[PDB]
Amino acid sequence: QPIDADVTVIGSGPGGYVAAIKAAQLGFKTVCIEKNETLGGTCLNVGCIPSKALLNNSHYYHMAHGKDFASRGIEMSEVRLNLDKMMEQKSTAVKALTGGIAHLFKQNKVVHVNGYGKITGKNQVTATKADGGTQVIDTKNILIATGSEVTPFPGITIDEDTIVSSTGALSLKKVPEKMVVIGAGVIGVELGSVWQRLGADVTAVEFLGHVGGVGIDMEISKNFQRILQKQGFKFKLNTKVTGATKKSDGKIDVSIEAASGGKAEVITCDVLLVCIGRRPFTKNLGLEELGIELDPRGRIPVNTRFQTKIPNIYAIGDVVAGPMLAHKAEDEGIICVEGMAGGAVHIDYNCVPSVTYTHPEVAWVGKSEEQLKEEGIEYKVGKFPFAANSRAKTNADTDGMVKILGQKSTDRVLGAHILGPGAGEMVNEAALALEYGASCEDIARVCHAHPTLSEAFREANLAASFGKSINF
Amino acid sequence: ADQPIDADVTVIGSGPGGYVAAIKAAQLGFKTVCIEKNETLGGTCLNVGCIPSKALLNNSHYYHMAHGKDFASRGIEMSEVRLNLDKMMEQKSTAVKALTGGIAHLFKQNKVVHVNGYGKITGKNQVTATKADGGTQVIDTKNILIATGSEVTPFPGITIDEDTIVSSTGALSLKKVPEKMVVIGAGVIGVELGSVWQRLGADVTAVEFLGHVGGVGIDMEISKNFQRILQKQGFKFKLNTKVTGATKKSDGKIDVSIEAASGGKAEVITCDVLLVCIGRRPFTKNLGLEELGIELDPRGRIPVNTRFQTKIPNIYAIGDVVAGPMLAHKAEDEGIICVEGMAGGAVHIDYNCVPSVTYTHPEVAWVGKSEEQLKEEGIEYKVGKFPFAANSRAKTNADTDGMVKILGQKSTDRVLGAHILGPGAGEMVNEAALALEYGASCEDIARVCHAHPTLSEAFREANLAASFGKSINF
Ligand SMILES: Cc1cc2nc3c(=O)[nH]c(=O)nc-3n(C[C@H](O)[C@H](O)[C@H](O)COP(=O)(O)OP(=O)(O)OC[C@H]3O[C@@H](n4cnc5c(N)ncnc54)[C@H](O)[C@@H]3O)c2cc1C
Ligand SMILES: Cc1cc2nc3c(=O)[nH]c(=O)nc-3n(C[C@H](O)[C@H](O)[C@H](O)COP(=O)(O)OP(=O)(O)OC[C@H]3O[C@@H](n4cnc5c(N)ncnc54)[C@H](O)[C@@H]3O)c2cc1C
């Protein structure tokens, strides 16, 4: 019964399932171990894919129900929401994509073992299926793609009915009247905006005095806040959550206190969303037996080749340090199995972009103005408002700006910050530019098609290199 | 009449080429004068071209989705969806109005002098315009920049009255949705304007001399697939067919006499509105070229060298008035690098890096060379294809139409061509433009991390399918 393999990847997330396909195409005998019953990990089942679907569907409702569609001569009498069908589109997408990973596994001759795998040896990993039937796999190299889980709030138990986590908010059966979201990060802002667009009164509470989560420019974050609040988003900043108490009616009273602690308030909501953070998932893997010591935050330490202290054991994804993003895990999985094949392993996390898929979109790659302030790097600022982009005025989507940060002397593009429409796809152009080591002059002299939103990317680069943009 | 103005650069034209070149040169330390005959700055693209058409293309697609099964299928239930064409056109007009004022504000912000009139080159170092009133304005300038632009290429024997027989202009300000419409010319402008009204309930039949759609330099695979998707959207395409003539009738409808390009297969089809857009051509009327002896080319474009200079050194010409793709970003770049050469610099622009976008839904955008262009040149290539049905962000949005085709050289793996048919192709092609400018290979693009989930992931995954041979998610 025990199968032998070359590379055994524990995990079907973005990291694992991509690494599984890649390694198999590289000539390796690969085995993917999945504890859940649907391949895809967090991003496909409970993470990126479902949230983006609801964000799109809600935004389309917001435009119809709002002044937008009427403003373009699309006059409608009755706009109504069938939440069952909106969620049906979410379900249809996730189902097809999960099955795709399965088809891809067979297309690329990857072995799927459904079970809870545990490393039972330097060259041995044992999975436990729910039934109890053993499946031990001995392999030369082991890849840990176990992923992450939701960080629990002290004293607040998520029941996924009235007090939900990221998971529960994605399969809610009714729109809350008032909703309190703990955590003003990417996951929080997105899910809050979804229900706010669907008629909920959404108040978000944050210990920190900024929005948008990790590594967001303050100018970008502040302007993001201003636009969201006008859309109807309520933000309680610099505030610690004292506690949560469920009531007889079924509502949740949320005890709130200032970050200093001076002013306490108790607000009510129909649904409480908890998403203060996510944490690496290293439960029951055997790491303690093998003596791979975790880090204080719980992430598996690895070298630049993504090997653990034990050489033939590798670890990639949310389980290791770095941005807890899906394309990060994807790249880390590819380059890891490519180093096993004999290649070199280099990844600059400065090139890794971060996208908030709201409307307006927020996407950034590189370093914020603040990060450069601390490091001592003097920079020039280039800003082009979307109110001057032709395609944005054409589409009546004049919100936000593109901020390009270039070194005062070398003109190297140090950071790219895009607040506004289509920022999620625009940041991939900045990623390509940063990898090449481009300057602000390089980007400006490349012809960008007219009229496109990407023209703001070029014009902001010009305003940083030359000092003056053409159309502003 | 007024005192002769002396300047460094005098730009004849307020189009994308002229108005950008005017701003750039003024910021470069030159004394600049922009001469525009019309009363709204912006040229074709702002007044009659890109901006108005893209506005209606966007508004029509939103209508098509609401009126269609799409919005309901995602849980957006609407009882009565109706079209107030008056307001749809009001949004188009409001945008163009504001953008026209923007060019004016930009000119005043950058100390550019605007002279409204029909300019005439009255000297190697002098240009005098004739304003509508007749009061003349003499401008002495070291160098003169010709950005006069283009005009509608007329079909022989069909006179555009801008009521029943319209050009691009009239199709953009129609006052009622035609029941049946015939478009002469299945190019970019034709497909877009046809799709707009087809989505608004017109039965749109477009006729083309050639056996393909999408105009110049489109891959045949891309063009054929483009046709299929539009045809299911309700687009009628009579290809390989020449228009013998058009007759306006007593009722006011237009009978369009049709014959095959091969000959025979004759039919007379009827329509309520006839749109003529078989091409555009450079506008060089009353420019002063005859006095100075600058001879035009057979197709009517002003010949220029690599520095965009005419036969006369201090006279330069950029935009649709010269050869090359008749695109708005083309004129913009040529204007910048021309005035950058005037201040002191080298002038190089690769037309292979210039992208071409069809702003329909699905969008078509390509940069570089098609499979056909490479077959004639003798460049052997590898094909990399990633369908949008496998891109995560496309499946999430229920927008799985189309694919991305990457063409790479057999040996060097240099990205020779990038072809994107599908959602968001207009913004994705700028990434391919950036790659081609740097001279990147398919390996280079694939190893750059693309954010998940984004449509651009198809760009990366197709590059991988051309470099390595196997895509990850396909
Ligand atoms: C609501 C939400 C929205 C998000 N939106 C975005 C976004 O827009 N963009 C973005 O880039 N990221 C986003 N993320 C983050 C993204 O989901 C993660 O970064 C990504 O899932 C990381 O994948 P991974 O490779 O680390 O593996 P994960 O998918 O994190 O790992 C989970 C998988 O490992 C398996 N597994 C774990 N332990 C075992 C074991 N012992 N045996 C067998 N199988 C095991 C599980 O069964 C599961 O399949 C979002 C996350 C959430 C929660
Ligand atoms: C319907 C339509 C849609 C289009 N869509 C797109 C698209 O999506 N993308 C794209 O890239 N391109 C598009 N184009 C093409 C685009 O409009 C042109 O390529 C662009 O306008 C070229 O600008 P230009 O600098 O050559 O000057 P133009 O804009 O062509 O015109 C220059 C100006 O100079 C003026 N002028 C001429 N002679 C004189 C004179 N003697 N004295 C004073 N003033 C004078 C003219 O009146 C005009 O205003 C479209 C065109 C049309 C018609």
Numbering used by the authors:
A (entry chain B): 3 to 474
B (entry chain A): 1 to 474
What does the study report here?
Dihydrolipoamide dehydrogenase (LADH, E3) is a mitochondrial flavoenzyme operating as one of the components of the α-keto acid dehydrogenase multienzyme complexes (the pyruvate dehydrogenase (PDH), the α-ketoglutarate dehydrogenase (KGDH), the α-ketoadipate dehydrogenase (KADH), and the branched chain α-keto acid dehydrogenase (BCKDH) complexes (c)) and the glycine cleavage system. The role of LADH is to regenerate the catalytic activity of the above complexes by oxidizing their E2-subunit-bound lipoic acid (LA) prosthetic group and simultaneously reducing an NAD+ co-substrate. The LADH reaction is governed by the ping-pong bi–bi mechanism, which is structurally supported by two separate substrate-binding sites; the dihydrolipoamide substrate is oxidized on the si face, while the NAD+ co-substrate is reduced on the re face of the isoalloxazine ring of the FAD prosthetic group. The LADH/E3 component is a functional (obligate) homodimer since residues from both of the monomers have catalytic roles in each active site in this dimeric enzyme; the redox-active disulfide bond (Cys45–Cys50; the numbering reflects the sequence of the mature human (h) enzyme) resides in one of the monomers, while the catalytic base His452′ is part of the adjacent monomer (indicated by ′).
The disease-causing I358T mutation was found earlier to quite significantly reduce the specific forward and reverse LADH activities as well as the ROS-generating activity of hLADH (in the reverse catalytic direction); the respective residual specific activities were of similar magnitudes (41, 30 and 53%, respectively). According to the domain structure of hLADH, the residue Ile358 belongs to the dimer interface domain. The residue Ile358 is also in the close spatial vicinity of the isoalloxazine ring of the FAD prosthetic group. According to the I358T-hLADH crystal structure, the Ile358 to Thr358 substitution led to no significant structural alterations in the hLADH structure. Neither any considerable displacement in the neighboring peptide Cys449′-His452′, nor any significant changes in the active site could be observed. Near the mutation site, the dislocation of the His329 and Tyr359 side chains could be observed; the hydroxyl group of the residue Tyr359 moved closer to the carbonyl oxygen of the residue His452 (catalytic base). In the wild-type structure, the His329 side chain is in H-bonding distance to Pro355(O), His-452′(N), and FAD(O2). In I358T-hLADH, the His329(ND1)-FAD(O2) distance increased to ~3.6 Å; the weaker interaction might have affected the binding affinity and/or redox potential of the FAD, potentially contributing to the observed reduced enzyme activities. In the H+/H2O channel, the residue Glu332 could be modeled in a conformation that pointed away from the active site. Owing to additional minor dislocations of the channel-forming polar side chains, altered polarity and geometry could indeed be observed near the active site.
